[PDB]
Ligand binder design. Structure first.
Ligand SMILES: CC(=O)SC[C@@H](CCCCc1ccccc1)P(=O)(O)O
Ligand SMILES: [Zn+2]
Ligand SMILES: [Zn+2]
Length: 230
């Protein structure tokens, strides 16, 4: 029932309802000769929608906006990118062209600029130290410390007990670290520990790629990272 990579041609986007007023969005994109699925989040914010992460590329993000208009019909008014790589900020220009106010931490904005990626317009203050959390409409943003990247944020929806880990959290079936180019393998288990401490009550955990699960994904990810380290 959760859509898989084989079911979503590149350029199409699926919406999956996780709880009332909470959806994931699922897209697919080419990376180094293979196509991968990728998740983001959509959260009802009163009469508006809060978007967490692009759909990995301009074309996919446009399809996401279209699918949202068709299936939900509320405007996306704000978007947060959880780190600076293309699967998270690629498409920010499309969001801005459609009237969406784009946000990310100062760190993410700077790293995106250096990388030559699209740059979210607005900075999110209050997230510069490991353990920092801030409220952002219907969600809490949390910086757990360096993991998949040094800037990676996670997102909690308190009304639904949904934890979106982004690329810091792996799906259960995944045994192999992916692109760990900007990763901090030594810090990553500690950062997961911070997430586990801060959100002990999470009922649903959404990884950056693949199938949703529960808090068991946190331990699974730590095991995989440590294996790539041992
Ligand atoms: C999310 C990651 O692991 S890094 C993001 C890169 C894409 C990563 C896809 C890696 C992957 C490998 C195996 C299964 C799922 C995803 P990009 O810099 O092109 O946005
Ligand atoms: Zn990344
Ligand atoms: Zn990713």
């Amino acid at each position: 029932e959760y859509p898989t990579v084989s079911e979503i041609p590149v350029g199409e986007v699926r919406l999956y309802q996780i709880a009332d007023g909470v959806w994931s969005h699922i897209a697919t994109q080419s990376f180094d000769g293979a196509v991968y699925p990728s998740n983001g989040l959509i959260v009802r914010d009163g009469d508006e929608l809060l978007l967490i992460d692009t759909a990995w590329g301009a074309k996919n993000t446009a399809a996401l906006l279209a699918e949202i208009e068709k299936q939900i019909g509320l405007p996306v008014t704000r978007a947060v990118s959880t780190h600076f790589h293309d699967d998270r900020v690629g498409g920010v220009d499309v969001l801005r062209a459609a009237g969406v106010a784009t946000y990310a931490s100062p760190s993410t904005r700077r790293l995106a600029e250096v990388e030559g990626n699209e740059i979210p317009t607005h900075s999110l203050e209050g997230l510069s130290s490991s353990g920092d959390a801030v409220r952002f409409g219907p969600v809490e943003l949390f910086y757990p410390g360096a993991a998949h990247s040094t800037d990676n944020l996670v997102v909690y929806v308190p009304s639904a007990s949904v934890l979106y880990g982004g690329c810091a959290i792996y799906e259960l079936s995944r045994t192999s670290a992916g692109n760990v180019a900007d990763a901090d393998l030594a810090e990553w288990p500690t950062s997961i520990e911070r997430i586990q401490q801060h959100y002990p009550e999470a009922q649903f955990v959404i990884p950056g790629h693949g199938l949703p699960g529960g808090l068991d994904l946190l331990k699974h990810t730590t095991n995989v990272v440590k294996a790539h380290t041992n």
